[PDB]
């Protein structure tokens, strides 16, 4: 029976990592997967995380199953981070949160939930977007449509085309938005643009679904949540899939959350019971460790202060590398203007290189980037910057 | 969009956990969820596990993403446990293993893998069986069929009814088998019966799917795999979803595995690529903490020896409670023979109690059991045995 199965292509992102770990030539540079790296080029575990883990090792007395929706405090801390400490959504108990295995897991439970319990048939995603978005929703049998987003000429948000392309999104359709640090463009809407979309969203009857995987990597925790909060004060219902993989450096512990928001407490609890049914038929209940670490840190004022400082340092090192990248490209003789890179948010910048050049950089200079031209700026260091820019210039 | 969602019914297993937690009676007894308890009534963290976690805390340098299929060593160690150190499936490289979030997760990925890449239409499940089996397969869009298994009169396995029931399973159909410690009956096939089923399976043309969540709780590690090893030596293709939740006491860390077996190395790798795709669209990659603990314990002989002794103590304490249970029931006035309980394997015992009785035990005496009459013997201790048996006799 397994003879008739046709092989699957390699993940355009996770695959690259294997092709890199395979390359034998010295000096290789990995600018693929969106994982943070410090000045020495390593992905260390945060100090606040090592501390939390020591606390858990000493105080855990059992590994007994968590409830289907995970750790209670985890859900509470998540909601404050997203909506704000005094939020009315929280005070009116209009939101329920389930701890999930990563942001991906949050996206999948939301998709399964929507497919099995609502009349949702279509999800609208930006073009371009994280490749895995279409796969997650299709996995639940949901049709995925794309809306315009990037002005590749001015390296900015094509707001006019975005509005026009979403004209066909009907009431009941789900529209996916990146909370901040759009992947892979790094271009986010301004608060004014968010407000416009929020209004348009309510009038058209869309079900907003926010993917929040980089909160704190744009400007700050609270600032990066402004777009979501503009919608939240405007809508009756919405879904938010968030991830702690990057802002806590907990990639492999799979820590995320799927937050459901309904018109009132009675409706959300009812709907949430069906979300739990969906989780139960998938992985039963969430992994404890990653989420325990996060709940511990967010709950302890002393630990939280350290974490917030570590997040700030990562954010600043990236912005620092953004400026150094543009300066070195000039220094090394680039005639093309890359100034636009300074205006992008997060780990990824859309370089504007053609799939051809991207392959030439790899098989010829040993530099790895995603075929879309997306480069992980957080992977750049003072030590590989020069060879990197020298490679790019040579392929321009 | 959420106004008309109908509330979902509570899980017949995980639901009780919340009821029990809420009950105010100081003398409540929990015999519901299949979780091990020591003589003190606690669900401790194994010593082998605690030591392994100390190693990790001390030596982990990064939390960087694992890889769709997880830790390689983990995959190698579970195949040896399942097939045997010098198995032909291993040497001939016919097997691929993906690390999954618990056995439940392993079941869902296998289900998704099958529904999206093959012609499989329905899955055959024992009657009775773990309630979640139907939910997991129906969620992936697969039709579920039940085959006879338990003789409620003689409290034994009705091999005649089992074989006659399965004669209706067409080729290409999937048939689910519990590796050992059948849930909820506790009655497993003899090697001879396994021998037959294996032969009948190849001839009938079924795709065997083994659920192995209790290896080591029946007779022993190697011994409990006999049934599986019998099918392995005969079939070209098979799937095994295993769990480390119980034999390692790592319930909430979600540690499981899904092993794919094909005719040759080329076919399995081709098929496994789609399984990785199914995973990527679900939770992307697996949680590292639990799987890491298992890998290091199974890899270190000094640690391994400790773990194996701990598993033996757990298996033996359960056996001692099983005997104590039957003896105490007669002493407290049981007007019936519960000897059949001694013949059951695993953590449970199919008591024979009706739903109305189980219902009465909870509300009238605060003794919690599953509505099917399934009782967790691993939850019985020398201290709660008396009150527990008195309650049962009273509703008899
Ligand atoms: C928009 C976006 N949404 C959801 C996720 C899911 O994150 P999770 O917590 O790992 O499940 C990621 C991770 N993006 C990478 C940084 C990680 C690798 C990947 O593709 O999953 C990236 O390279 O894009 C995203 O960029
Ligand atoms: C046959 C069987 N299969 C799969 C699983 C899944 O295990 P996982 O690794 O936790 O995903 C369980 C756990 N059964 C319980 C011991 C746990 C509660 C539950 O229903 O999941 C039980 O009480 O049956 C099983 O009994």
CA-wise closest residue to A201 among A178, A226, A177, A225:
A177
Count of H-run helices and E-run strands, chain B:
14, 13
Inspect the interface and report whether the beta carbons of B136 and A281 lie closer than 8 Å: yes
d(CA B347, CA B333): 24
Distance between CA atoms of residues B87 and B76, nearest Å: 12
Compute φ and ψ for A151, nearest 5 degrees: -95, 95
Quick one: which of B212, B229, B221, B262 has its CA closest to B107?
B212
- Taken in order B208, B213, B217, B223, the sign of the CA dihedral is positive
Instruction: Say whether residue A265 is in contact with chain B using an 8 A CB cutoff.
Output: no
**Structural domains in chain A plus CATH codes:** 11-44+316-396 (3.90.1150.10), 45-315 (3.40.640.10)
Cis-peptide, bond into residue B184, ω within 30° of zero: yes
- B85 neighbors A272 (Cβ within 8 angstroms): no
Query: Do A96 and A268 contact (CB within 8 A), yes or no?
Result: yes
CB contact under 8 A, A2 and B270: yes
How long a stretch of residues is chain A?
Answer: 396
What is the CA angle B11-A254-A70, rounded to 5?
30
Residue A39 has a CB neighbour count (10 Å cut-off) of 11
Calculate the CA B91 to chain-centre distance. 27
Q: How many CB atoms lie within 10 A of CB A170?
A: 11
Whether B361 contacts chain A with CB within 8 A: no
**Of the bound ligands, which one is closest to the alpha carbon of residue A103?**
1
H-type alpha helices, chain B:
14-22, 47-59, 72-83, 88-91, 102-117, 132-139, 159-166, 191-204, 221-232, 265-280, 288-299, 301-331, 355-365, 385-395
Q: Binding-site residues of B for L-aspartate, please?
A: 34, 130, 183, 374
Farthest-apart Cα atoms in chain A, separation: 63
- Any idea which residue has 């009785």 for tokens? B357
d(CA B90, CA B160): 35
Peptide bond into B128 cis (omega under 30): yes
Nearest to B252 by CA among A278, A99, A79: A99
CA dist B360 and A65 (Å) reads: 26
| Resolution for this experimental structure (Å) | 2.2
Q: Cα separation of B40 and B36, whole Å?
A: 11
Helix segments in chain A, DSSP class H: 14-22, 47-59, 72-83, 88-91, 102-117, 132-138, 159-165, 191-204, 226-232, 265-280, 288-299, 301-331, 355-365, 385-395
Gap between the Cα atoms of B108 and A57, Å rounded? 31
Residues of A marked active site are found at 130, 211, 246
Whole-Å CA distances, B82 to B90, B268, B332? 10, 17, 42
| Cα nearest neighbour of A276 on chain B | B8
Q: Please enumerate, as own/partner, the contacts of A88-93 that have beta carbons within 8 Å and a separation of 24 or more.
A: A88/A233, A89/A232, A89/A261, A92/A264, A92/A265, A93/A265, A93/A268
DSSP one-letter code for B231: H
Nearest-angstrom CA–CA distance, A203 and A198: 9
Nearest 5°: phi and psi at B52?
-60, -40
Cβ separation of A290 and B285 shorter than 8 Å? no
The DSSP secondary-structure symbol of A251 reads G
Could A252 and B290 be called an inter-chain contact, meaning their C-beta atoms sit closer than 8 Å? Answer: no
Which ligand sits nearest to residue A110's alpha carbon? 1
Q: Residues near A321 by Cβ (< 8 Å), separated by ≥ 6?
A: A377, A378, A380, A381, A385
Write down the catalytic residue from B130, B194, B206, B307. Answer: B130
Cβ(A123)–Cβ(A209) under 8 Å? yes
- Residue whose C-alpha is closest to residue B64's, from A99, A106, A174, A249: A249
Nearest alpha carbon to residue A290 among A320, A328, A253: A253
CB of A97 within 8 Å of a chain B CB? The answer is no
Q: What is the spatial distance between Cα B237 and Cα A392, in angstroms, rounded to a whole number?
A: 48
Query: Helix, strand or coil for residue B176?
Result: strand
Neighbours of B317 (CB within 10 A): 18
* A179 touches A227 (CB < 8 A): yes
Q: State the closest ligand 1 atom to the C-alpha of A376, by its place in the atom list counted from 1.
A: 23
* A183 annotated to a ligand binding site: yes
Structure tokens at B137: 């397969």
CA distance A374 to A184: 6
Tokens, residue A159: 């707001």
CB-based contacts of B83, cutoff 8 Å, min separation 6: B89, B90, B95, B225, B228, B229, B232
**Residue B313 token pair:** 């103590």
Which residues of A are less than 8 Å from B259 in CB distance? none
CB A144 within 8 A of CB A137: yes
| CA proximity to B175, closest of B235, B219, B217 | B235
Tokens describing residue A288: 């404890």
Alpha-carbon distance of B139 to B147, in angstroms, equals 20
Task: Give which of B121, B270, B284 to mutate to test A binding, by max A Cβ within 10 Å.
Answer: B284
Under a CB-based contact definition with an 8 Å cutoff, are residues A211 and A218 in contact? no
Place of tokens 């009169």: B153
The residues, ordered by sequence, that sit 6+ positions from A136 with a Cβ below 8 Å of its Cβ are A104, A107, A108, A111, B281, B282
**Of the candidates B256, B100, B132, the residue with the CA atom closest to the CA atom of residue A254:** B100
How far is Cα B338 from Cα B350, in angstroms, rounded to an integer? 10
Number of Cβ within a 10 Å radius of residue B73: 15
Token pair belonging to A307: 């974490």
CA B33 from centroid of its chain's CA atoms:
12
Tokens at B194, concatenated: 């396994």
**Cα–Cα separations (whole angstroms), residue A157 to A162, A195, A210, A299:** 8, 15, 18, 37
Ligand 2 pocket by C-beta < 6 Å: which residues?
A 284; B 13-14, 33-34, 102-104, 130, 132, 178, 183, 211, 213, 243, 245, 256
Please name the residue that has the structure tokens 């701890």: A99
d(CA B133, CA A276): 16
Inter-chain CB proximity A7 and B262 less than 8 Å: no
Mutate to test the pocket of ligand 2, among B178, B183, B248, B254 (most ligand atoms within 8 A of CB): B183
How would you classify the pairing of strands B122-126 and B174-178?
A: parallel
Contact A353, A365 (CB under 8 A): no
Residues of chain B found within 8 Å of residue A261, distances taken between Cβ atoms: none
């Amino acid at each position: 029976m397994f003879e008739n199965i046709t092989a699957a292509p390699a993940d355009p992102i996770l695959g690259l990592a294997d092709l890199f770990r395979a390359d034998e030539r010295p000096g290789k540079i990995n600018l693929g997967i969106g994982v943070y790296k410090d000045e020495t080029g390593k992905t260390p575990v945060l100090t606040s995380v090592k501390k939390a883990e020591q606390y858990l090792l000493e105080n855990e007395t059992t590994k007994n199953y968590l409830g289907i929706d995970g750790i209670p405090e985890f859900g509470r801390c998540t909601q404050e981070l997203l909506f704000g400490k005094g939020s009315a959504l929280i005070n009116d108990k209009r939101a329920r949160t389930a701890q999930t295995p990563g942001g991906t897991g949050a996206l999948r439970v939301a998709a399964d939930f929507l497919a099995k319990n609502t009349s949702v048939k279509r999800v609208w995603v930006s073009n371009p977007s994280w490749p895995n978005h279409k796969s997650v929703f299709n996995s639940a049998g949901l049709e995925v449509r794309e809306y315009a987003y990037y002005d590749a000429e001015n390296h900015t948000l094509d707001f006019d085309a975005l509005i026009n392309s979403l004209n066909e999104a009907q009431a009941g359709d789900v529209v996916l938005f990146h909370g901040c640090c759009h992947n892979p463009t790094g271009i986010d809407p301004t608060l004014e643009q968010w407000q416009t979309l929020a209004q348009l969203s309510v009038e058209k009857g869309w079900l907003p679904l926010f993917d929040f995987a980089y909160q704190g990597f744009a400007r700050g925790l609270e600032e990066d949540a402004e777009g979501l909060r503009a919608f939240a004060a405007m809508h009756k219902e919405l879904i938010v899939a968030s991830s702690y993989s990057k802002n806590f450096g907990l990639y492999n512990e799979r820590v995320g959350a799927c937050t459901l928001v309904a018109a009132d407490s009675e409706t959300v609890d009812r709907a949430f019971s069906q979300m739990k049914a969906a989780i139960r038929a998938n992985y039963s209940n969430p992994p404890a460790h990653g989420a325990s670490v996060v709940a511990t840190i967010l709950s302890n004022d002393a630990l939280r202060a350290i974490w917030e400082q570590e997040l700030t340092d990562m954010r600043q090192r990236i912005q620092r590398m953004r400026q150094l990248f543009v300066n070195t490209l000039q220094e090394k003789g680039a005639n093309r203007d890359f100034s636009f890179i300074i205006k992008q948010n997060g780990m990824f910048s859309f370089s504007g290189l053609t799939k051809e050049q991207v392959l030439r950089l790899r098989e010829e200079f040993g530099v790895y980037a995603v075929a879309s031209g997306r480069v992980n700026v957080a992977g750049m260091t003072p030590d590989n910057m020069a060879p990197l820019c020298e490679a790019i210039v040579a392929v321009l």
